Design a protein around this ligand. Sequence first.
Ligand SMILES: Nc1nc(N)c(N=O)c(=O)[nH]1
Ligand SMILES: Nc1nc(N)c(N=O)c(=O)[nH]1
Lengths: 261, 261
Amino acid sequence: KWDYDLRCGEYTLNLNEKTLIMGILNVTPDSFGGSYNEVDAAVRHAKEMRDEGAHIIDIGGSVEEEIKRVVPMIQAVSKEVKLPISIDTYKAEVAKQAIEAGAHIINDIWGAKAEPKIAEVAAHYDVPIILMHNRDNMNYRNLMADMIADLYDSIKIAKDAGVRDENIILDPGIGFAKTPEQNLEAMRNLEQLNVLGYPVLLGTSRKSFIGHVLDLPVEERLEGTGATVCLGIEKGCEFVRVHDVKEMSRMAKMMDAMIGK
Amino acid sequence: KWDYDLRCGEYTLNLNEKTLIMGILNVTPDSFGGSYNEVDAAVRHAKEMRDEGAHIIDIGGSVEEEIKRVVPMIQAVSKEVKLPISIDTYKAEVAKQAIEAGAHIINDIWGAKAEPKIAEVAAHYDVPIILMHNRDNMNYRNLMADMIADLYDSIKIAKDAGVRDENIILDPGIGFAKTPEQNLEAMRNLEQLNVLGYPVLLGTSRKSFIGHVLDLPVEERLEGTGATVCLGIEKGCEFVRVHDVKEMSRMAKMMDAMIGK
Ligand SMILES: Nc1nc(N)c(N=O)c(=O)[nH]1
Ligand SMILES: Nc1nc(N)c(N=O)c(=O)[nH]1
């Protein structure tokens, strides 16, 4: 199905053998970047997730401030944990610094629209970039049609910046610029993103539309996240972005055995 | 989609609004049927499951011995918990007694093949009956083709005994007469059972094929059962048979919101 591998400098991700788990790194800051408690807690937690089945660690970010916070964690983590690191920013300068600091993948929630020059940063360092569906409004003529249109406007910016098709991963942006009923409608029609020809990452972990259905606080969302990850993998997605790495690695793995991936 | 309701004497199950959860009643016997600890523990546990989202309680069974064990639990539970009770037997006499004792549904793991007269018991009391795929051997020419053939031989016996179409629920018998690879193949092709025209119950809770994939003991099977319940509901099934009622009710419910049931 994929005729290539996701190349990440030192690490390669095969896209055929299994659903790839992206671990959401917990970034509780200190009231005082760099300091000992916040980097140490980020490392212990990247290590926990490596040990419970994560294949990528996702590290989330006032511009020079964002860099001072995030660069030290990428250095200490890339050092101490042997996994690819994605950097969660829409700022081109923050992205430049992160890959320089040791990050492998750009994770952009504005899909190169926030700051187009980010795609030039991906182009140059030749890293994979995740383009997420997002928009600054919620006026959908047709939810899925508009979604697929908007993602395509992202791919045009990425490609016009030098980005190779093989470094493009797409993401439906569940929980961004979508009512809770539009979120459930995007889950129900996720297979449509496949027509675009690119690997798909789903990020649904703990989000309010799960609590809208279940009527449950954020710490009570494990089973509902499970259901989204499963429908996700059944609908074709290549990665899932989760906080609960142990549980979702097991669900992912059972789904894989069944769907025959 | 269903143009009728599952009629159960006092209780009716609507088959359209939600995936129906069947709770597996825990039947630890006493070394001495009827006695106080075993009926009391069965009741407390039927009550727990009623409170965590179960819609049916499934009560599982030397023939006169099976009846002395199971009749008292059906009396105390039907009394103290206001849910329909299915009776898990393939013996016609055990089934007769159970419905007389207050049970609403017959749950037959031999699909009227073990003892054909069970279908006469269903016919007469006019109760729903679950016909499970099972066979005393494992020589499949074509797993799904043979499955659907064998289930049809069950429906013929049921119907020839007087059973109305509307009292027939089918079950693919995951974990019966199937290698672990055939179990995963039946999960992957579950939607085929829909051509037969009947509601489908899935029972996958904690079964060794989950541990074959995950390589995990029976008490470590929650996430893998979750994955089967989800693929199950996505593939069209109307009921799921589970031990972990709290967790699977939440998964079921999230899946329902998404698939649009
Ligand atoms: N790709 C991606 N990045 C994020 N920061 C997300 N936030 O939830 C998401 O769903 N997807
Ligand atoms: N219907 C039904 N009854 C049982 N006793 C089962 N056992 O696991 C099952 O999977 N399905």
